[PDB]
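User: Working on a comparison across species. This one is human lysozyme from Homo sapiens. Can you predict its structure so I can line it up against the others?
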Amino acid sequence: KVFERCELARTLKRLGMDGYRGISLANWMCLAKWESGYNTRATNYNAGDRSTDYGIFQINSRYWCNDGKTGGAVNACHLSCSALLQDNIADAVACAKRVVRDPQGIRAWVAWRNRCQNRDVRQYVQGCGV
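Assistant: Here's the predicted structure for human lysozyme from Homo sapiens:
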């Protein structure tokens, strides 16, 4: 599914993402926006290392989910990568929370660093009632 901006912001608030491990809601919004355009079915194959990024947060199969074809991969979120392509984002959110529990936090995503870090991200949540 392709979420609308404020619909996603309200969903993420309810799922407890606001301030999770010190990360504001607008930072999560900025991340979803640049990783998938708020698209839960997005997938990106990395020909260079044979991994795939899945879902709204573009979570990688080398460490976080199992797709069986990745190669020396772990499944830190204990999920099939298929779970990250559902319209319901509860599993994707649970996994994104696991990702930021590692030392890098939100910096795990290079898109976050280039496109969101040290920027005015208020635009992503403006007028959503969150």
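For your comparison, note: Residues 1-130 form a domain with the Lysozyme fold (CATH 1.10.530.10).

User: Helpful, thanks.
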